[PDB]
Design an enzyme around this catalytic site. Structure first.
Site, PDB file in Angstrom:
ATOM      1  N   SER A   1       0.843  -1.183   0.000  1.00  0.00           N
ATOM      2  CA  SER A   1       0.000   0.000   0.000  1.00  0.00           C
ATOM      3  C   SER A   1       0.873   1.225   0.000  1.00  0.00           C
ATOM      4  CB  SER A   1      -0.944   0.029   1.215  1.00  0.00           C
ATOM      5  OG  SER A   1      -0.257   0.402   2.397  1.00  0.00           O
ATOM      6  N   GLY A   2       0.290   2.346  -0.400  1.00  0.00           N
ATOM      7  CA  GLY A   2       1.003   3.612  -0.432  1.00  0.00           C
ATOM      8  C   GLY A   2       0.222   4.658  -1.193  1.00  0.00           C
ATOM      9  N   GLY A   3       0.931   5.613  -1.780  1.00  0.00           N
ATOM     10  CA  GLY A   3       0.281   6.654  -2.573  1.00  0.00           C
ATOM     11  C   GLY A   3      -0.635   6.086  -3.649  1.00  0.00           C
ATOM     12  N   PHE A   4      -0.293   4.902  -4.152  1.00  0.00           N
ATOM     13  CA  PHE A   4      -1.074   4.220  -5.195  1.00  0.00           C
ATOM     14  C   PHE A   4      -2.379   3.566  -4.721  1.00  0.00           C
ATOM     15  CE2 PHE A   4       2.284   1.353  -3.654  1.00  0.00           C
ATOM     16  CZ  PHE A   4       1.549   0.249  -3.238  1.00  0.00           C
ATOM     17  N   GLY A   5      -2.527   3.367  -3.412  1.00  0.00           N
ATOM     18  CA  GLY A   5      -3.718   2.721  -2.847  1.00  0.00           C
ATOM     19  C   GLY A   5      -3.333   1.464  -2.089  1.00  0.00           C
TER      20      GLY A   5
ATOM     21  N   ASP B   1       5.924   6.572 -14.182  1.00  0.00           N
ATOM     22  CA  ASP B   1       6.450   6.068 -12.897  1.00  0.00           C
ATOM     23  C   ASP B   1       7.219   4.764 -13.110  1.00  0.00           C
ATOM     24  OD1 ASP B   1       6.958   6.390 -10.147  1.00  0.00           O
ATOM     25  OD2 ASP B   1       5.084   5.442  -9.523  1.00  0.00           O
TER      26      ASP B   1
ATOM     27  N   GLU C   1      -4.082  -9.299 -13.597  1.00  0.00           N
ATOM     28  CA  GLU C   1      -3.383 -10.570 -13.697  1.00  0.00           C
ATOM     29  C   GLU C   1      -2.324 -10.627 -12.607  1.00  0.00           C
ATOM     30  OE1 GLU C   1      -0.860  -9.575 -17.201  1.00  0.00           O
ATOM     31  OE2 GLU C   1      -0.068 -11.620 -17.020  1.00  0.00           O
TER      32      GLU C   1
ATOM     33  N   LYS D   1      -6.634  -4.333  -6.603  1.00  0.00           N
ATOM     34  CA  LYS D   1      -6.145  -3.001  -6.274  1.00  0.00           C
ATOM     35  C   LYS D   1      -7.307  -2.096  -5.923  1.00  0.00           C
ATOM     36  CE  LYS D   1      -3.681   0.947  -8.266  1.00  0.00           C
ATOM     37  NZ  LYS D   1      -2.559   1.339  -9.153  1.00  0.00           N
TER      38      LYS D   1
HETATM   39  N1  LIG Z   1       6.258  -2.930  -5.682  1.00  0.00           N
HETATM   40  C1  LIG Z   1       4.882  -3.428  -5.823  1.00  0.00           C
HETATM   41  C2  LIG Z   1       4.395  -4.048  -4.491  1.00  0.00           C
HETATM   42  C3  LIG Z   1       3.009  -4.650  -4.697  1.00  0.00           C
HETATM   43  C4  LIG Z   1       2.003  -3.572  -5.101  1.00  0.00           C
HETATM   44  N2  LIG Z   1       2.522  -2.663  -6.171  1.00  0.00           N
HETATM   45  C5  LIG Z   1       1.572  -2.011  -6.984  1.00  0.00           C
HETATM   46  C6  LIG Z   1       1.480  -0.626  -6.905  1.00  0.00           C
HETATM   47  C7  LIG Z   1       0.517   0.013  -7.677  1.00  0.00           C
HETATM   48  N3  LIG Z   1      -0.303  -0.673  -8.462  1.00  0.00           N
HETATM   49  C8  LIG Z   1      -0.246  -1.995  -8.549  1.00  0.00           C
HETATM   50  C9  LIG Z   1       0.693  -2.708  -7.815  1.00  0.00           C
HETATM   51  N4  LIG Z   1       0.778  -4.033  -7.866  1.00  0.00           N
HETATM   52  C10 LIG Z   1       0.299  -4.874  -8.783  1.00  0.00           C
HETATM   53  N5  LIG Z   1      -0.582  -4.727  -9.773  1.00  0.00           N
HETATM   54  C11 LIG Z   1      -0.700  -5.924 -10.372  1.00  0.00           C
HETATM   55  C12 LIG Z   1       0.091  -6.820  -9.754  1.00  0.00           C
HETATM   56  C13 LIG Z   1       0.374  -8.169  -9.922  1.00  0.00           C
HETATM   57  C14 LIG Z   1       1.298  -8.747  -9.047  1.00  0.00           C
HETATM   58  C15 LIG Z   1       1.896  -7.984  -8.036  1.00  0.00           C
HETATM   59  C16 LIG Z   1       2.843  -8.509  -7.126  1.00  0.00           C
HETATM   60  C17 LIG Z   1       3.959  -7.750  -6.753  1.00  0.00           C
HETATM   61  F1  LIG Z   1       4.127  -6.511  -7.248  1.00  0.00           F
HETATM   62  C18 LIG Z   1       4.914  -8.247  -5.868  1.00  0.00           C
HETATM   63  C19 LIG Z   1       4.775  -9.530  -5.340  1.00  0.00           C
HETATM   64  C20 LIG Z   1       3.675 -10.300  -5.711  1.00  0.00           C
HETATM   65  C21 LIG Z   1       2.721  -9.790  -6.590  1.00  0.00           C
HETATM   66  F2  LIG Z   1       1.672 -10.551  -6.927  1.00  0.00           F
HETATM   67  N6  LIG Z   1       1.547  -6.700  -7.954  1.00  0.00           N
HETATM   68  N7  LIG Z   1       0.734  -6.169  -8.728  1.00  0.00           N
HETATM   69  C22 LIG Z   1       3.950  -2.281  -6.215  1.00  0.00           C
END
Ligand SMILES: N[C@H]1CCCN(c2ccncc2Nc2ncc3ccc(-c4c(F)cccc4F)nn23)C1
EC number: 2.7.11.1
Length: 273
Positions: free
Chosen positions: A14-18, A135, A89, A35
């Site tokens: 979690s963070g600025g992104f939600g 980003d 996904e 998300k």
């Molecule tokens: N550095 C990542 C940590 C996890 C959350 N993250 C996100 C930030 C903003 N929007 C989306 C995400 N994460 C995200 N969207 C789709 C996926 C699909 C997989 C993952 C994921 C990941 F990012 C890390 C470990 C396992 C996971 F399943 N994260 N993820 C950043």
């Protein structure tokens, strides 16, 4: 509808992104990421063909959706009274590039080459689809550890690609170019190239080159790790102070350091398995 279709797992981050959770689609056990973003925290709003008002993130994700695996696939979305929920996904097993680099330290150049190349292909795809990510960083790159394939995630700070100046920015400051720091102005492609230079340095040195505004503004790159001259040259080129002095994507991919890239599967066999 939502709660029946998905089994929620632990919080991924979690963070600025939600807030983002691991989950599973009940119908077929498909791994997903869920998300959540609070409506009040969304400044950037877009519109679908329907006329339905949605977060720009959804618009951008739809614009980049295809068979191309270098960008995270949006599987579904839902509106709630005070938030939007995106179903994405989730490769398995997966690790984000930030954790991957934390674990390994500085990446061998053969691996950084494969990774960087895939990021370039992904970013080119976004741009071809009219989308600017804004980003690009290790935290927003996923590594499919079995296939050796990288994917861009978090289009929540992105925008429609345009040829005119951007005067807004909600991405990560330490990846942001000197023209943003000094003038609060940047153009899409040349700013992306700056962030790619930060990324590449991060991969081959195991840390970012600049912490403070004055470092970014001065743009002097020091290498703390052993890095080849060809790689140092590409990084320094991407990190040119003047936007117009930075390479185009074509020039990056034609650079000597970028030749003879491994295939993703080769990359996984050698470096990830
Ligand atoms: N550095 C990542 C940590 C996890 C959350 N993250 C996100 C930030 C903003 N929007 C989306 C995400 N994460 C995200 N969207 C789709 C996926 C699909 C997989 C993952 C994921 C990941 F990012 C890390 C470990 C396992 C996971 F399943 N994260 N993820 C950043």
């Amino acid at each position: 509808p939502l709660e029946s279709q998905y089994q929620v797992g632990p919080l991924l981050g979690s963070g600025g992104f939600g807030s983002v959770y691991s989950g599973i689609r009940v119908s077929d056990n498909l791994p997903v990421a869920i998300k959540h973003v609070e409506k009040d925290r969304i400044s950037d709003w877009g519109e679908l063909p329907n006329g339905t008002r949605v977060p720009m993130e959804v618009v951008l994700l739809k614009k980049v959706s295809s068979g191309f695996s270098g960008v995270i696939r949006l599987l579904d979305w839902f509106e709630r009274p005070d938030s939007f929920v995106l179903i994405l996904e989730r490769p398995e097993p997966v690790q984000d590039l930030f954790d991957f680099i934390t674990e390994r330290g500085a990446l061998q150049e053969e691996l950084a080459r494969s990774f960087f190349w895939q990021v370039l292909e992904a970013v080119r795809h976004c741009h071809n689809c009219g989308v600017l990510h804004r980003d690009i960083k290790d935290e927003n790159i996923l590594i499919d550890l079995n296939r050796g394939e990288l994917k861009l995630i978090d289009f929540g700070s992105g925008a429609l690609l345009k040829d005119t100046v951007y005067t807004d920015f909600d991405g990560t400051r330490v990846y942001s170019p000197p023209e943003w720091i000094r003038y609060h102005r940047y153009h899409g492609r040349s700013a992306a190239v700056w962030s790619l230079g930060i990324l590449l340095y991060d991969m081959v040195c195991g840390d970012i080159p600049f912490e403070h505004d004055e470092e970014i503004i001065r743009g002097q790159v020091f290498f703390r790790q052993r890095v080849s001259s060809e790689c140092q040259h590409l990084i320094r080129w991407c990190l040119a102070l003047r936007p117009s002095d930075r390479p185009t994507f074509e020039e990056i991919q034609n650079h000597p350091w970028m030749q003879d890239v491994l295939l993703p599967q080769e990359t996984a066999e050698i470096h990830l398995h």
